[PDB]
Write a protein that binds this ligand. Sequence first.
Ligand SMILES: *[C@@H]1O[C@H](CO)[C@@H](O[C@@H]2O[C@H](CO)[C@@H](O)[C@H](O)[C@H]2NC(C)=O)[C@H](O)[C@H]1NC(C)=O
Ligand SMILES: *[C@@H]1O[C@H](CO)[C@@H](O[C@@H]2O[C@H](CO)[C@@H](O)[C@H](O)[C@H]2NC(C)=O)[C@H](O)[C@H]1NC(C)=O
Ligand SMILES: *[C@@H]1O[C@H](CO)[C@@H](O[C@@H]2O[C@H](CO)[C@@H](O)[C@H](O)[C@H]2NC(C)=O)[C@H](O)[C@H]1NC(C)=O
Ligand SMILES: *[C@@H]1O[C@H](CO)[C@@H](O[C@@H]2O[C@H](CO)[C@@H](O)[C@H](O)[C@H]2NC(C)=O)[C@H](O)[C@H]1NC(C)=O
Ligand SMILES: *[C@@H]1O[C@H](CO)[C@@H](O[C@@H]2O[C@H](CO)[C@@H](O)[C@H](O)[C@H]2NC(C)=O)[C@H](O)[C@H]1NC(C)=O
Ligand SMILES: *[C@@H]1O[C@H](CO)[C@@H](O[C@@H]2O[C@H](CO)[C@@H](O)[C@H](O)[C@H]2NC(C)=O)[C@H](O)[C@H]1NC(C)=O
Ligand SMILES: C[C@@H]1CN(c2ccc(C#N)c3ncccc23)C[C@H](C(=O)N[C@H]2CNC[C@H]2F)O1
Ligand SMILES: C[C@@H]1CN(c2ccc(C#N)c3ncccc23)C[C@H](C(=O)N[C@H]2CNC[C@H]2F)O1
Ligand SMILES: *[C@@H]1O[C@H](CO)[C@@H](O)[C@H](O)[C@H]1NC(C)=O
Ligand SMILES: *[C@@H]1O[C@H](CO)[C@@H](O)[C@H](O)[C@H]1NC(C)=O
Ligand SMILES: *[C@@H]1O[C@H](CO)[C@@H](O)[C@H](O)[C@H]1NC(C)=O
Ligand SMILES: *[C@@H]1O[C@H](CO)[C@@H](O)[C@H](O)[C@H]1NC(C)=O
Ligand SMILES: *[C@@H]1O[C@H](CO)[C@@H](O)[C@H](O)[C@H]1NC(C)=O
Ligand SMILES: *[C@@H]1O[C@H](CO)[C@@H](O)[C@H](O)[C@H]1NC(C)=O
Ligand SMILES: *[C@@H]1O[C@H](CO)[C@@H](O)[C@H](O)[C@H]1NC(C)=O
Ligand SMILES: *[C@@H]1O[C@H](CO)[C@@H](O)[C@H](O)[C@H]1NC(C)=O
Ligand SMILES: *[C@@H]1O[C@H](CO)[C@@H](O)[C@H](O)[C@H]1NC(C)=O
Ligand SMILES: *[C@@H]1O[C@H](CO)[C@@H](O)[C@H](O)[C@H]1NC(C)=O
Lengths: 731, 731
Amino acid sequence: KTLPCDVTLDVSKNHVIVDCTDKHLTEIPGGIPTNTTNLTLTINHIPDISPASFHRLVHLVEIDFRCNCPRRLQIKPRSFSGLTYLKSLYLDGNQLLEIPQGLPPSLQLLSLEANNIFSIRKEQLTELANIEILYLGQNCYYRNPCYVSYSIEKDAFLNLTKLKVLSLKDNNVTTVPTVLPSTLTELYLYNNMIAEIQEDDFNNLNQLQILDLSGNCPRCYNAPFPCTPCKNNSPLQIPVNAFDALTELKVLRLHSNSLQHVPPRWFKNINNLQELDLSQNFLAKEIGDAKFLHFLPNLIQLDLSFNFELQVYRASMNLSQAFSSLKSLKILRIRGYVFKELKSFQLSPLHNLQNLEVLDLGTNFIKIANLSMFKQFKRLKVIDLSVNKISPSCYKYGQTLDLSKNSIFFIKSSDFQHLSFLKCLNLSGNLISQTLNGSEFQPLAELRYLDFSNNRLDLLHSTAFEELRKLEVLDISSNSHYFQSEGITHMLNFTKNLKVLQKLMMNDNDISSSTSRTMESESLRTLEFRGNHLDVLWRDGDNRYLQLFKNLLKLEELDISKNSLSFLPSGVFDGMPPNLKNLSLAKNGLKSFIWEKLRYLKNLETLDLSHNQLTTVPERLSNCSRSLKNLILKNNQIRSLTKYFLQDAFQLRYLDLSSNKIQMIQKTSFPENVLNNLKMLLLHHNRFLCTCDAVWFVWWVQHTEVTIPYLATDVTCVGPGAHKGQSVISL
Amino acid sequence: KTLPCDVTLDVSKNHVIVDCTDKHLTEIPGGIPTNTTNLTLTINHIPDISPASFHRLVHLVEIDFRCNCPRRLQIKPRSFSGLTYLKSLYLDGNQLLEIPQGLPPSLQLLSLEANNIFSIRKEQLTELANIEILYLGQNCYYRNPCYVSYSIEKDAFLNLTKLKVLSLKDNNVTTVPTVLPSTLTELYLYNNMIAEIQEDDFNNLNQLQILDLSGNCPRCYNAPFPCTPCKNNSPLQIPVNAFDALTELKVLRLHSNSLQHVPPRWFKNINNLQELDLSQNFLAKEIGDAKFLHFLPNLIQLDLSFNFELQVYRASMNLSQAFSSLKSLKILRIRGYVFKELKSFQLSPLHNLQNLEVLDLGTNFIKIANLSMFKQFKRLKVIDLSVNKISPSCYKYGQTLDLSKNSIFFIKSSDFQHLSFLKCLNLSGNLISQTLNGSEFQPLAELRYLDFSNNRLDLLHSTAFEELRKLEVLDISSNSHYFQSEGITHMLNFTKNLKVLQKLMMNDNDISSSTSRTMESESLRTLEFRGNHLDVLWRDGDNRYLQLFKNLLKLEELDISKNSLSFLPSGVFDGMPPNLKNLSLAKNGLKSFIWEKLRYLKNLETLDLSHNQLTTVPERLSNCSRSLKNLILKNNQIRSLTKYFLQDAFQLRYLDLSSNKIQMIQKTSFPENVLNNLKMLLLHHNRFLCTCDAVWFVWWVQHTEVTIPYLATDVTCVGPGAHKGQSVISL
Ligand SMILES: *[C@@H]1O[C@H](CO)[C@@H](O[C@@H]2O[C@H](CO)[C@@H](O)[C@H](O)[C@H]2NC(C)=O)[C@H](O)[C@H]1NC(C)=O
Ligand SMILES: *[C@@H]1O[C@H](CO)[C@@H](O[C@@H]2O[C@H](CO)[C@@H](O)[C@H](O)[C@H]2NC(C)=O)[C@H](O)[C@H]1NC(C)=O
Ligand SMILES: *[C@@H]1O[C@H](CO)[C@@H](O[C@@H]2O[C@H](CO)[C@@H](O)[C@H](O)[C@H]2NC(C)=O)[C@H](O)[C@H]1NC(C)=O
Ligand SMILES: *[C@@H]1O[C@H](CO)[C@@H](O[C@@H]2O[C@H](CO)[C@@H](O)[C@H](O)[C@H]2NC(C)=O)[C@H](O)[C@H]1NC(C)=O
Ligand SMILES: *[C@@H]1O[C@H](CO)[C@@H](O[C@@H]2O[C@H](CO)[C@@H](O)[C@H](O)[C@H]2NC(C)=O)[C@H](O)[C@H]1NC(C)=O
Ligand SMILES: *[C@@H]1O[C@H](CO)[C@@H](O[C@@H]2O[C@H](CO)[C@@H](O)[C@H](O)[C@H]2NC(C)=O)[C@H](O)[C@H]1NC(C)=O
Ligand SMILES: C[C@@H]1CN(c2ccc(C#N)c3ncccc23)C[C@H](C(=O)N[C@H]2CNC[C@H]2F)O1
Ligand SMILES: C[C@@H]1CN(c2ccc(C#N)c3ncccc23)C[C@H](C(=O)N[C@H]2CNC[C@H]2F)O1
Ligand SMILES: *[C@@H]1O[C@H](CO)[C@@H](O)[C@H](O)[C@H]1NC(C)=O
Ligand SMILES: *[C@@H]1O[C@H](CO)[C@@H](O)[C@H](O)[C@H]1NC(C)=O
Ligand SMILES: *[C@@H]1O[C@H](CO)[C@@H](O)[C@H](O)[C@H]1NC(C)=O
Ligand SMILES: *[C@@H]1O[C@H](CO)[C@@H](O)[C@H](O)[C@H]1NC(C)=O
Ligand SMILES: *[C@@H]1O[C@H](CO)[C@@H](O)[C@H](O)[C@H]1NC(C)=O
Ligand SMILES: *[C@@H]1O[C@H](CO)[C@@H](O)[C@H](O)[C@H]1NC(C)=O
Ligand SMILES: *[C@@H]1O[C@H](CO)[C@@H](O)[C@H](O)[C@H]1NC(C)=O
Ligand SMILES: *[C@@H]1O[C@H](CO)[C@@H](O)[C@H](O)[C@H]1NC(C)=O
Ligand SMILES: *[C@@H]1O[C@H](CO)[C@@H](O)[C@H](O)[C@H]1NC(C)=O
Ligand SMILES: *[C@@H]1O[C@H](CO)[C@@H](O)[C@H](O)[C@H]1NC(C)=O
């Protein structure tokens, strides 16, 4: 089948999926199966649509036709009336001026985003009486302007009795389109120019659950996007008796509305509100009072970020006592509340929130913060202490103290006292210049993850991190400052004292010398050593560091890549861990990789040599390794394989030679006896010349079921002559 | 003259200087003038020396032979005895094991640095009875080891009655070389392994002026170099009665000696001490006491940097009251004294030093610092407030407040109050995100320079920097954050209100759009606009921003380079300042730079088109411009000049076509009537093919006096065949 689009079959789901994503077709291809259900026609060069485009396809329930656009796109009349079983259609980014007509009554979803439709009338919506979801957003804003306000005729959406989802974002709307259908459940009116809300705007939405009114009359100070604030810097005028009929409301986003007060009368009728967004407002004084929090006992999320007032640097964080009424609160982000010093009793209202897990306090420029005050927030899961200026992922491991990008330049044992419950500690970006001695992280008895990346660490002692008995993952990446120095001791055998260490990231360290001859660990299984200098360590005639990873008995993941290795000295594979399982040598510069030495690795399965400068493939992979399964030779320089490349290599299950200079592949090197089990195989972006010398290649590539991606677009033919750019399956 | 080395003549001085710096010679060339005075033989591949090397050269006064080394250098006996008028000699970095013998008595200077001389005896210094300066440093240290202690026989240097300067730095010295000659004036004994000083070491040095004992018993914590601290972390043991005979001592450097106390008895006899270095020590407690400062009334410089105690973060700087006894103090470095808060009265001892000019307080991690306290240090010249974490060149303009790389994230008018005397304000690296309004820098009435580079500026108002009435130079470079945003207003006409602005740096801003059509200034003379995007501003069919620089009437130097300009639209030269004098378009990417429009610039003199992708030179430079004199077409892609390039063009004074693909140059395009006035001309690293078609080129290049640098090494010949790599003067 010469279809250039992927096909997926789910007989239980009776769905046949044909997707042509980013394939640059100029017309709908012929031969599309009649039993397809999901059709994708995203970014492409399709000129227009016609009734013959979907002539014989009656079992279609989905058409994805997003962002296809010399001029705009035109749709013929009765272009979709023959799609009786149609249920969803995307027409986003097509520069359509008006809603297409003739759509089947069975249509359930319709997306018209990023178009030029700025006028909505009842007559054009008469055919959408059974629609469920309508996406009419992004029709008039700074990225795609229309220079006029959105026009809604009276009761345009009223007769859409089945409508539940309606998004009118980024549409230059001035007033709420009354009257909306009573069956609405999600209303997205955010990022518009609606300046006032009427009391008769939401009388009939009794089933509404999500209401987004974000960006109307926005806070435009230092805004990286074109936004027009309201007149006289007024907030979005919402009456007190506006959210009356909203009884099933669960999400209410009021982000960036320049709000100064939040009346408690707004939350009088919405009993089951779960998420409330109030970011980018002027509620810094309201946070001190926060009377409206007493009407939200079921609130789950509360975003109050970036509510600071300009030219004011507060001495303290003024949280109200009404924050204790948030019984069900879990996530509380109060970023952008810039203030000087964080004290112990400023978080007193949150001391009894049993369901509180995340406490975000980043981007506040906090200077003084006693970390011992967090011994009361042990039940929490994330304690965010981000880019603020405090001076002396991990979420799966337990309690997390994210101290990244602070002003900590040295570590004291007393600073981390009363923090034994910590399971992770993120110290990334602090630029700590310290020679570790094994006593800094003493109170961190239960620490399991320690992030020390983007710092200045000095491995002068092998007793570094010795007191982290329960540490499992250690990240000391991007500490290249002291490792770049030559002649000072670099004790790389500091991992011997770590009894339960499992993973070690120490990459991008520019390590070129080591006093310690070997690295020792009886529990390490993953070690990333990329972006370093093993060429000097494995220099010609230098056998000192050949067995650098031999003593890592349990090591199963070695990531020595980007290490400027022009060649591997003969003998390094003898000094490799016995239990090495997956290996990576990507982006190294490897000129010649010897293959018969791979027999010493009797457990390797995923040798990775992507983005290398190799030239020759092994003579016989079976004689090389008896367990290698997942070869990755992407972006290599290979011109032709061996006559018996995959002979007797039954254990292979993955192969990758994409982006090479290969010319021809014959049968005797690729027997089907092996190819029947290959789960994956890549041979695209290479230099196949499609002459008559590859009759078997032509026959096999278009008649086997071996998975080869991009078999009709990216894997082309270089010759001869008129056969330039030919598809390997079109031969 | 085919000498590949430059020649300089000073008849009044009677020096003829020949220099072969970095010219890779294998042997001293023949034909060297007999009347030469200075000979330079720096880094090269010279195998050895012979008496015939300087056979007939009797008027030689200077020979330079630094860092020329299959094996080391070999010097034959009597290799310098024939140099009667020899006066100075350099043999640095030649791997010599012993001092060469046979040197003339008339030698005044002898440098033997970076060699392998680790043993000094009286017999080999017997010939140096008239030496004045001796540089025996860098003989045994971590970059060039010798694995043994530096050994000197007793009274080896004693009989050198004329010795004045002796540098034994980085030589693995253990004990001072008693007894030194009594006429010593400069002793550089720093960076050694001397742990003890005896009271009988400096008895005869009563004309000594500089004593360097830095790096002995060093402080090796966070040391980026291999340094060995002494036993028990002891300081350099100096007796109290050690600096007794030293009476004319002017400079005493004790940097990195791990000193804990500085007894006042040391400074009892040195009355005229001017510079005192005490950096990288443990004198944090001594600074609080500092009793020794009462014995230095003539001290000019006092370096007390990096005296912090480990794991100690002080709350304040404890400066002693004895700092007021430094009557003549001008220079003061107190960096590395890391502490929390800088208060007003902490600098009270410095309030009465009339000669104090600079006060450096960086690398201290100061958090709270009221900038209004510096209204007392008006007589100062530089107030360094660098990488410290304070939160809310210049030296030729007057008072400087260097607030670079601080923790200031917004600017208040009250913060800079009482700082009207400021002539500079360096706010670079603070990453201030602010929309300037014209009231932030209000108290800065007399500000003449403002560095605001590496920040986040938002040109939303044209009134930015309006209150800086006396501002002359403005630096807003590397503010690409908000300028990268598309659609927001960028008022580039903010310079109209600056009446006396003279220079403007606004580079690396990635500016792609501008609401303002033109830039206005009646006094701007220099404008640097590199690292921006003028290709989109001058996009095809976009005539909005063609006259962006017309209204800069007084502009005389424009720096629109690295701006991704593939081509200049026809008409931009019609939109240029009338008084434009210097112009730069380097590293842009000009595919075709027209020259006939250059007539519109009747004042241009330094059209700079280096590192571009031009192809064709103008037909006639005389018809192009009548005042151009400084072409720079370096690193261009030019293959041949036209037939009448410099025809009738007399006003040019500089020409640069280095690193091109030019092949042949004829006479009619380069008439000597023009070349007699060219001060400079570069034609190296090009692709001349030296066939028989260039007879005039061959004759002229080796018989004219037009200045052409690297005429024998870099400007080579591509052909034909055996003439590959031939020198243009060797033809
Ligand atoms: C193929 O089209 C069908 C019909 O539009 C898609 O089925 C919908 O999937 C979403 C996501 O789970 C559900 O919310 C809808 O209720 C489904 N509708 C129906 C009628 O089943 C299906 O997801 C599409 N397949 C692909 C790969 O896009
Ligand atoms: C949103 O609608 C307003 C109102 O029509 C548009 O404002 C017009 O903008 C054009 C182009 O700048 C002007 O010529 C008109 O005079 C404006 N009219 C008014 C009443 O102000 C605005 O441009 C629209 N926004 C977008 C992104 O198209
Ligand atoms: C420690 O903090 C840094 C800084 O936020 C985290 O780095 C970010 O990680 C997320 C998730 O992987 C990325 O999406 C961001 O791009 C990262 N930002 C930077 C600047 O690196 C880091 O992931 C944190 N450590 C852990 C273990 O999660
Ligand atoms: C050429 O050599 C002479 C002789 O060594 C140099 O003259 C010396 O210059 C220094 C620096 O000014 C003085 O301190 C010495 O007193 C001078 N000595 C004599 C004997 O004149 C001269 O500087 C050298 N010139 C160059 C360009 O290297
Ligand atoms: C400075 O001198 C000391 C003393 O001789 C040298 O120390 C020797 O170093 C070598 C090589 O490491 C050892 O084999 C010797 O045993 C050391 N001797 C002693 C007495 O400790 C030191 O190497 C020298 N420094 C340099 C840079 O050469
Ligand atoms: C403002 O402070 C910055 C930061 O120190 C100065 O930038 C340094 O300038 C010196 C002198 O030109 C250079 O040698 C350094 O390499 C620069 N460092 C950096 C990080 O840029 C800047 O020069 C100061 N402003 C003025 C006018 O001197
Ligand atoms: C959250 C605050 C808002 N800011 C401010 C700008 C102007 C002010 C005035 N007048 C102001 N006044 C008080 C408090 C904050 C102010 C800028 C500041 C900042 O430095 N932002 C960086 C940090 N790294 C990310 C980037 F967003 O962040
Ligand atoms: C000057 C101080 C010395 N430092 C320190 C290291 C270890 C300590 C322990 N125990 C310590 N204890 C107290 C005070 C400072 C300490 C590191 C600190 C620093 O962050 N250095 C960066 C800043 N940007 C340049 C680069 F040098 O600078
Ligand atoms: C019907 O569905 C099957 C699914 O396997 C598909 O192969 C076929 O092309 C479809 N159309 C037919 C049978 O006309
Ligand atoms: C905190 O806010 C409340 C009400 O907003 C106010 O009464 C109180 O004075 C504030 N306290 C501080 C320290 O800002
Ligand atoms: C931090 O809190 C702990 C426990 O309350 C206390 O012992 C310690 O002194 C505090 N540190 C500071 C600097 O206040
Ligand atoms: C690391 O090696 C050094 C010798 O180089 C040794 O003194 C030290 O005990 C070793 N430490 C560990 C943890 O293996
Ligand atoms: C090899 O890499 C894969 C990434 O695709 C990883 O999931 C696996 O754990 C690694 N080790 C193996 C396959 O032994
Ligand atoms: C003498 O000095 C002159 C200086 O102009 C120089 O040209 C000449 O080569 C020297 N040697 C002679 C004249 O032998
Ligand atoms: C300052 O130093 C002196 C002597 O070094 C000491 O007596 C005094 O207590 C110190 N004061 C402070 C605040 O450190
Ligand atoms: C800074 O000093 C000035 C003048 O002494 C004073 O008016 C101002 O209040 C001080 N600011 C702070 C924060 O102490
Ligand atoms: C800059 O131009 C704007 C119009 O774009 C104008 O309103 C403003 O007054 C101008 N300011 C100056 C200083 O020229
Ligand atoms: C142009 O720039 C050069 C830099 O080499 C400078 O010397 C000259 O004074 C400037 N002005 C001119 C040539 O008018």
